[PDB]
Structures are given as structure tokens and as C-alpha cells.
Amino acid sequence: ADTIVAVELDTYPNSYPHIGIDIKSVRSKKTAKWNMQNGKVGTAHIIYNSVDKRLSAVVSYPNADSATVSYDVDLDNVLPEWVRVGLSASTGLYKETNTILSWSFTSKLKSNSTHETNALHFMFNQFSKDQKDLILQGDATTGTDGNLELTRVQGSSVGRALFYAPVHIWESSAVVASFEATFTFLIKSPDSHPADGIAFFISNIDSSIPSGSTGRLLGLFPDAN
Amino acid sequence: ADTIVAVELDTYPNTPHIGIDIKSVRSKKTAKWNMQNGKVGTAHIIYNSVDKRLSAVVSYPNADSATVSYDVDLDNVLPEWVRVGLSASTGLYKETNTILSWSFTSKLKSNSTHETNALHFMFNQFSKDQKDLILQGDATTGTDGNLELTRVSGSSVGRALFYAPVHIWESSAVVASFEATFTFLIKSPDSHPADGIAFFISNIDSSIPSGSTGRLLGLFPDAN
Amino acid sequence: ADTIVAVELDTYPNSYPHIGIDIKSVRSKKTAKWNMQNGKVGTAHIIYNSVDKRLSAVVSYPNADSATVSYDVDLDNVLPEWVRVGLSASTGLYKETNTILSWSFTSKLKSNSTHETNALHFMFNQFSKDQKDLILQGDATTGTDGNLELTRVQGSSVGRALFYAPVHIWESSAVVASFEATFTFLIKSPDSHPADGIAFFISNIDSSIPSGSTGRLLGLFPDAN
Amino acid sequence: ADTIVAVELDTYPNTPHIGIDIKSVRSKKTAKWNMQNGKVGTAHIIYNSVDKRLSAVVSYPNADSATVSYDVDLDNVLPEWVRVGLSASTGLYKETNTILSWSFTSKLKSNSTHETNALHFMFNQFSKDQKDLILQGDATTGTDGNLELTRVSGSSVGRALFYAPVHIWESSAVVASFEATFTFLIKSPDSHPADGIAFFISNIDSSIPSGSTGRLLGLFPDAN
Numbered sequence: 001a002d003t004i005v006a007v008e009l010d011t012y013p014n015s016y017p018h019i020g021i022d023i024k025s026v027r028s029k030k031t032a033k034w035n036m037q038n039g040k041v042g043t044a045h046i047i048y049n050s051v052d053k054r055l056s057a058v059v060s061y062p063n064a065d066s067a068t069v070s071y072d073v074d075l076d077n078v079l080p081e082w083v084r085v086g087l088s089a090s091t092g093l094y095k096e097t098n099t100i101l102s103w104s105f106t107s108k109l110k111s112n113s114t115h116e117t118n119a120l121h122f123m124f125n126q127f128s129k130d131q132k133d134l135i136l137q138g139d140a141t142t143g144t145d146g147n148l149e150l151t152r153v154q155g156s157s158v159g160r161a162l163f164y165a166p167v168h169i170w171e172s173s174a175v176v177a178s179f180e181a182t183f184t185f186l187i188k189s190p191d192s193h194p195a196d197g198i199a200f201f202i203s204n205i206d207s208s209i210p211s212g213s214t215g216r217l218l219g220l221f222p223d224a225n
Numbered sequence: 226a227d228t229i230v231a232v233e234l235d236t237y238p239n240t241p242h243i244g245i246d247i248k249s250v251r252s253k254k255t256a257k258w259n260m261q262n263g264k265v266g267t268a269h270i271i272y273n274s275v276d277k278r279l280s281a282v283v284s285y286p287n288a289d290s291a292t293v294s295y296d297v298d299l300d301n302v303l304p305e306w307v308r309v310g311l312s313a314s315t316g317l318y319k320e321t322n323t324i325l326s327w328s329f330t331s332k333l334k335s336n337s338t339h340e341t342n343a344l345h346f347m348f349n350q351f352s353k354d355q356k357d358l359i360l361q362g363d364a365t366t367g368t369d370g371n372l373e374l375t376r377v378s379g380s381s382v383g384r385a386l387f388y389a390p391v392h393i394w395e396s397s398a399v400v401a402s403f404e405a406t407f408t409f410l411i412k413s414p415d416s417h418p419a420d421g422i423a424f425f426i427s428n429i430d431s432s433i434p435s436g437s438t439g440r441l442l443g444l445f446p447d448a449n
Numbered sequence: 450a451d452t453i454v455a456v457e458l459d460t461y462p463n464s465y466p467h468i469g470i471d472i473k474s475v476r477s478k479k480t481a482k483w484n485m486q487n488g489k490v491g492t493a494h495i496i497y498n499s500v501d502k503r504l505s506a507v508v509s510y511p512n513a514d515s516a517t518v519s520y521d522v523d524l525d526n527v528l529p530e531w532v533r534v535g536l537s538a539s540t541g542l543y544k545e546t547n548t549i550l551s552w553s554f555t556s557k558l559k560s561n562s563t564h565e566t567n568a569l570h571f572m573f574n575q576f577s578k579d580q581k582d583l584i585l586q587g588d589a590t591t592g593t594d595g596n597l598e599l600t601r602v603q604g605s606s607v608g609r610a611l612f613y614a615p616v617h618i619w620e621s622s623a624v625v626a627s628f629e630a631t632f633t634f635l636i637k638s639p640d641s642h643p644a645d646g647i648a649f650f651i652s653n654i655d656s657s658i659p660s661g662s663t664g665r666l667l668g669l670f671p672d673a674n
Numbered sequence: 675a676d677t678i679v680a681v682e683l684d685t686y687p688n689t690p691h692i693g694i695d696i697k698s699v700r701s702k703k704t705a706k707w708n709m710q711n712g713k714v715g716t717a718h719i720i721y722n723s724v725d726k727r728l729s730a731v732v733s734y735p736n737a738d739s740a741t742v743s744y745d746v747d748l749d750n751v752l753p754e755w756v757r758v759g760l761s762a763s764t765g766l767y768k769e770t771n772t773i774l775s776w777s778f779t780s781k782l783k784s785n786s787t788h789e790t791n792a793l794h795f796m797f798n799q800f801s802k803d804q805k806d807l808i809l810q811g812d813a814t815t816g817t818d819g820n821l822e823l824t825r826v827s828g829s830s831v832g833r834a835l836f837y838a839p840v841h842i843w844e845s846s847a848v849v850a851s852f853e854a855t856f857t858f859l860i861k862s863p864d865s866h867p868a869d870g871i872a873f874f875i876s877n878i879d880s881s882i883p884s885g886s887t888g889r890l891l892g893l894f895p896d897a898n
Contacts, residue, residue: 041338051280058275060336060399082805112284114265114408119796132755132839165838166805175284306581339788347568356531356615389614390581490787500729507724509785509848561733563714563857624733625718
């Protein structure tokens with residue numbers, strides 16, 4: 001199975017819409033109430049550092065309240081050293097979209113050594129149709145008004161975009177490793193109470209959507225069971 | 226008087242450790258520090274308004290690192306606008322408190338989509354006339370392209386502050402965060418020297434209080 | 450007199466609206482045609498580096514054409530080493546505004562020395578009412594919807610905002626010095642053909658608006674004469 | 675075959691200089707280079723679509739710098755998507771082509787308000803398993819935390835490419851710009867060594883052509 005660490009946002013009535021931190025399981029290690037806002041653009045900000053060992057996520061909407069969830073986890077003990085970072089989404093049987101308007105990420109490995117910092121950073125505010133630096137899985141596509149549609153714009157759609165370059169998320173010799181990620185999303189549905197999930201995840205480099213991970217398995221987990 | 230939050234590394238008797246001071250010289254949290262005389266050290270200080278915890282690591286090449294953290298809401302402690310700086314004091318010893326590099330980054334992300342207000346600077350080489358630094362006391366710039374916080378040749382305090390006020394919090398921001406790194410060199414010919422260096426954040430017109438020598442680091446006027 | 454190097458945008462019928470590079474004089478060293486677009490947000494991008502010694506500026510409008518002007522100048526020979534960088538605007542006798550929606554700047558001094566880079570960077574996407582890191586001159590004010598109004602929102606208004614910290618723009622020991630600046634502006638007028646000027650400028654640290662620098666002297670020059 | 679733009683520094687006879695090569699090994703522009711054996715050098719390469727000029731500086735500590743520039747519209751030369759890398763070749767000499775650090779930054783700013791697509795990486799320490807680098811030929815990572823482009827102990831070519839494709843141009847961008855810095859160390863025991871290092875940009879599946887030894891640098895298949 002893949003190793004997944006995910007910060008996910010979902011409305012699946014398994015049980016209000018919530019934001020949750022998932023460490024290797026769909027049974028969230030920590031959750032907080034999130035008030036989904038149909039048709040508004042949301043902003044999710046994920047941050048981690050190895051001195052604190054605290055994975056944290058804030059989701060806010062313009063003019064509305066922020067939902068925040070934090071969880072103590074040492075990712076050294078959870079992930080491979082080299083990973084791929086990406087975005088996932090799964091639709092229930094409703095008409096709705098999962099559009100990502102922008103995605104940026106920064107990883108930093110600071111050594112013991114004076115000024116020895118290794119860093120990766122990418123920022124996408126505009127996705128082209130041939131976004132060669134992204135691995136698109138599922139029903140995910142780019143170029144859609146310069147956006148990335150993660151789910152098919154077909155109920156029970158699942159889609160994922162991973163950044164191409166493997167990311168060195170930790171190292172047995174860094175005094176501080178840290179990453180931060182931010183994406184803006186828009187979830188539009190015609191329906192009153194649509195079931196939908198978006199997640200930012202970190203997995204082994206060769207992760208693939210497990211067979212049958214639709215719905216609240218979010219394109220990441222093969223099973224709750 | 227001035228409002229100070231500081232991460233300080235010192236060896237003063239008054240009974241080596243790294244410590245977090247929130248407004249008083251009586252450290253809210255300290256860890257044991259293994260001062261390596263003549264070796265270059267690096268302090269990394271980090272804070273964000275989601276976790277509300279101030280953390281630091283000091284490391285030396287060969288891997289003795291020390292780290293300390295304190296959960297504090299700096300909105301409730303600091304003014305909205307602050308100046309940031311480096312401070313140091315020597316007891317009666319021949320010693321240096323050299324800063325080879327210092328960099329800082331501050332971000333306020335709004336609830337508004339495409340948020341960010343940011344400030345960042347990086348000093349890897351100090352000039353003799355370093356106009357973007359406010360030098361207080363015995364601090365000087367330029368000696369080897371470095372910053373000397375105390376005077377190089379027995380009781381000397383010095384402080385360097387970045388010129389621009391920094392916006393460290395704003396009421397509607399979804400996350401405020403800052404980060405600071407500085408590499409320092411404390412070189413004493415004496416084996417067990419009394420010395421202290423600190424990264425601090427203060428009201429924008431902080432100046433060295435009367436009597437802030439020794440373990441008060443140029444920061445505090447008393448041991449309250 | 451101050452030393453001014455400015456990239457300015459103006460419609461003063463002295464003589465189409467143009468973008469011009471000004472080195473110490475209001476009599477632009479180089480100009481290009483600019484088609485002012487009332488009520489639209491424009492983006493100006495200024496870049497310089499000391500290897501090329503080419504000061505360049507691009508102004509674009511969403512969906513419209515770009516105006517670009519470039520000029521060979523070695524700023525080592527023009528400016529003091531330490532400067533203040535800022536934004537200026539002057540209105541003719543028309544009703545119109547000069548609103549800056551965002552301003553970001555980056556200066557970098559790279560030494561001969563391995564990894565010896567000094568850098569300053571600031572980004573404002575939101576200006577508060579008490580923007581303590583800006584020196585406001587003239588009729589300039591902040592907090593206006595989180596914007597900076599450079600001119601009074603009074604015909605023959607002049608206003609300027611300078612960043613607080615002196616900037617080390619060059620050095621006799623850097624192998625490459627460079628800066629880049631970007632700001633978004635909105636110029637609204639009710640009038641058909643309003644006369645207005647906006648500039649990004651670099652001056653000595655203690656520059657002030659010269660007495661009587663209204664109109665096409667832009668808050669920078671004391672005289673054409 | 676592969677499309678190459680390269681900034682190369684070499685000492686091959688074939689008659690020291692830094693040069694800009696746009697698709698051929700016959701440099702479009704060269705300047706005189708004063709190779710300092712055993713000293714660490716730093717190459718800085720810069721380009722933006724407004725000026726449409728590719729520029730480079732190589733400096734050594736003690737200030738011999740060399741610089742070269744060429745006015746070229748890289749949209750008309752390069753594919754839209756490229757990979758970037760470092761390349762080196764040794765004649766028959768004992769020598770190293772060590773890379774101590776390499777960093778790159780690419781930006782595409784749209785006409786759209788709040789533009790930016792960006793990529794940046796910074797390597798100051800290479801790992802033995804450096805999965806974000808594609809190593810070709812004799813190049814290896816990890817030796818001292820460094821990248822060795824040719825093999826360290828007579829005719830060796832090696833190239834390192836960053837994994838992710840880079841978007842270096844887009845048709846609606848108001849300015850595309852990139853920047854590259856790398857510090858290198860060429861150490862030969864021999865006084866006048868034949869060697870060449872290059873920063874290059876290629877189609878994303880460039881590989882070492884047959885016969886690209888010596889002055890062809892692992893980049894070109896012939897002297898055309």
C-alpha cells in the first residue's frame with residue numbers, strides 16, 4: 001500500500017463537513033468542523049517543521065471563518081525520505097467540480113553546516129493544457145481556463161495531480177526540515193448537500209490511485225473496509 | 226519600558242543554556258547549551274500564528290544541537306509593529322560576539338485570496354557603512370565584512386536592529402509567521418567565558434536600558 | 450537637487466500617453482507609446498542588472514498589449530550607493546485617482562565570494578492605515594480599501610510613498626547587483642482625456658517632493674523650465 | 675538531434691575562454707577566461723524575455739571575473755519545455771569537475787494580474803541518492819556531499835539534469851526570465867589541463883551524443 005499523509009477536506013456523510021489530518025489511514029487522526037461554501041474560492045495553507053513536529057492546516061474563505069487542525073507527527077517516522085507531493089479529489093454521486101486555481105509548495109532541508117540549505121519551490125497560478133511538470137492521474141485535466149480540474153467536469157469521478165520531481169522531505173542529517181503548501185480551490189455543485197473530498201497529500205514516489213478508492217477514500221486509500 | 230521577546234544563548238554564572246525570554250530576563254524555557262569556543266554556530270528561530278509556538282535550534286558543525294520551544298501567542302505580547310535585532314554582552318573577558326550572517330523573513334497571509342504581505346532581508350557581508358542597520362552601544366559593522374556586537378580589542382553591550390519596522394501581526398491575517406537565522410562566532414582565549422548573544426523583537430524605538438549588563442543582555446533593565 | 454532615476458507613465462499633453470525612462474531629468478531619455486486604459490488595472494515590471502546595464506520596463510493590461518522601454522545606463526555612475534525606492538503620482542486639473550493595489554521589490558548584491566549574497570525584498574498586497582514601513586509624502590494615504598492612494602481622492606494633487614529602509618543598490622565589490630520592481634495601479638478618471646503621471650523612482654535617501662513639482666514634473670523634478 | 679543552448683568554460687586546444695553556444699559548438703560569443711586551478715569559481719547566468727539577451731559572469735575570489743552576452747530570443751531557439759543541467763568533459767589529464775552548489779530559478783509572469791508561475795531549486799549538498807537529478811555518463815553524487823561531473827580517480831564526460839521539465843517560455847507571458855548559479859572546482863595536478871564545464875538547457879530527453887568528447891562537452895555530436 002502507499003504511504004499517505006494527507007490533509008483533507010470533505011463533506012461525505014459517513015458527520016458534518018470537516019477538515020482532517022490523515023496519517024496512513026482514511027480514519028482521520030484529527031478533524032475540525034469545516035463549513036463548505038458552495039461556489040466560493042477557499043484557501044488551504046499546510047505547514048510542517050521538524051523542530052516542532054506538528055503538522056498544521058488552516059482553511060479559510062474570504063469574509064468567512066477559518067477552520068484549523070494541527071497534529072503531532074514526526075514525518076521522519078512515517079514517510080520515505082523521498083516522496084511526491086500532490087492534490088487529490090473524489091466526487092460522490094452529485095454534479096460538482098473540484099477546480100484548483102493555484103498551487104504552490106516549498107520544501108527546505110537545512111544542514112548542520114553553515115549556509116547548507118537545499119530548497120525546492122514551485123508556484124502555479126496558471127495551468128496549461130500540456131503541464132509537463134505534473135503527473136495527472138484519474139479524471140484530472142489541465143488547461144480548463146488555465147485551471148486544473150481534478151475531477152471530471154460523471155458522478156464517482158476520482159482525479160489526482162502529483163508534481164513531477166521527487167521531493168526530499170527529510171534527511172537523517174538536517175537540523176531542520178520544513179515544508180509549506182497552499183492551494184486555492186473552488187467547489188461548485190448545483191445540489192444542496194453534495195458529497196465531495198479534496199486533499200493535499202504526500203506519498204511514496206510511485207503512488208497510484210488504488211483500485212476502487214472513490215468517495216471518502218479520496219483517491220488515496222484502497223479501503224476503509 | 227521596552228517590550229522584549231528574545232531567544233538568548235548565555236554562560237553567565239548567575240544562579241551554558243539557550244532560553245526563551247517573554248518580557249523578563251527570567252526565561253520562560255531554557256535548554257542546556259554546549260558553547261563551542263572558537264567555532265561558528267547557527268541559531269534558527271521560527272514562529273507561526275497557527276501553532277503559536279516559538280522554537281529555536283542552535284547547532285555546531287559535528288552535531289551538537291540544542292532546541293527549545295514555548296507556546297505563546299505573540300499577538301498578545303508584542304505590539305503590532307516591532308523592530309528586530311541582535312544583541313550581546315561580555316562579562317570581564319577577552320571575547321568576541323561576531324555575526325557572520327543574519328537573515329529574516331516575515332509573512333502576513335490574509336483571508337483575502339492572494340494574501341501576502343512579506344519582508345525578507347539577508348546579510349552575508351556587512352559594510353562599514355551599513356545604513357539599513359541601527360547600531361547601538363559597542364556594536365560596529367565592517368570588520369572583515371562582519372558585525373561585531375561587543376567591542377573587540379571587559380563589560381560591553383552592543384545591539385544591531387534592522388531599520389524598517391516589521392509588521393509582525395495584523396488582526397485579519399489567517400497566518401502570520403516569521404523566521405530568523407544567524408551564524409555567530411564567540412571566540413575567547415579564556416576557557417570558561419561569561420557571554421550572551423540574543424535575537425530579540427522589540428517596540429520600534431527600543432534602546433539599551435541603563436544597567437542591562439551581563440545576564441540582562443542589553444535587553445532588560447533588571448532581573449525582575 | 451535629488452538624484453532621480455524614474456520609470457514613469459504619463460498622459461500629459463506636453464505627445465501621446467507614453468511610458469519613459471528618466472535619468473536625472475524630466476526630459477525622458479527614452480519613451481514608448483502607452484495606451485492608457487481608464488479604469489483598468491495595469492501592471493508595471495521594472496528590472497535592472499549590472500552585468501547588462503540595461504534598465505527595462507514593461508507595462509501591460511489584462512487582454513491588451515504590452516508597452517516596453519529599455520535604456521542602457523550604469524546606475525553605479527548615476528546613483529548614490531544607498532538609496533530609497535518609491536512610487537510617485539501627480540494629477541493635472543482633472544478628477545482622477547492613482548491607486549496602487551500592490552508593490553513588491555527585490556534588491557540583490559552578489560559578491561565575488563562564494564554564496565555571499567545580500568538581499569532585500571518586500572511585497573505589499575494590502576496597505577494598512579498605519580503603514581509604518583512607508584514614508585508617505587504629499588497627498589498620499591493608505592488604508593483606502595487596503596490600497597495606497599498616491600494622489601488626493603483636488604486637481605493638482607501630488608503624492609509619493611517611499612519604502613522606509615535605505616536600499617544598497619550598488620557596491621564597488623559586487624560581481625552582480627540587480628533589482629526588480631512590480632506594482633499594480635488603477636487610474637480612474639470621469640474625464641475623456643485626463644492628464645496624469647505615475648512613476649516608480651529611485652532617489653537619494655532623504656528625497657522630498659521639490660517645491661512646485663506638480664503636473665509633468667511628477668513629484669520628482671523641481672523644473673523643466 | 676538535441677537542441678542545446680549552453681554557457682561553457684573550457685581550455686581545449688582546438689584552434690581558456692567562457693562562451694555562449696546556441697545550438698552549435700561554434701560559440702556565438704566568447705571572452706578570455708583565466709582558469710584558476712584548485713580555486714573555487716562561481717558562474718552566474720541570467721536571461722529575461724524583455725532584453726532578450728543571455729549573459730554570464732564567472733569570478734574567482736581575488737576578483738578576476740569574466741563576462742559575455744549574446745542577444746538572442748530563446749523562444750525561437752528552444753522548445754517550450756526544456757530540462758536544465760550541468761555538463762563536463764576532461765581530456766587525458768588527472769582532473770576534477772566538482773560542483774559544490776547549483777541553483778536555478780525560472781519565472782513566467784502573465785499579462786493576467788497576479789501572474790506568476792515559478793520554479794526554483796537550490797542544491798548546496800548532494801546526496802549519494804539524489805533522486806531529483808538525472809545523472810548521465812560518469813557523473814556521480816555524494817562524494818563529500820558534492821557532484822562530480824567526470825570520474826575522479828582520461829577522457830570522461832558526465833552530465834547532471836534536474837528531474838522536472840522546466841517551462842521556459844509560454845506565448846502570452848509578459849516576461850519570462852531564468853537565472854542559474856553554480857560554484858565549481860577544477861583541480862588538476864597538471865599545470866595546463868584540457869577541461870570544459872557547461873550549464874546547458876536542452877529538449878527534455880537530451881542524452882550524451884556519441885562522440886561528444888573533449889571540446890564538444892557531452893553536448894554536441896560534432897564540430898558543425
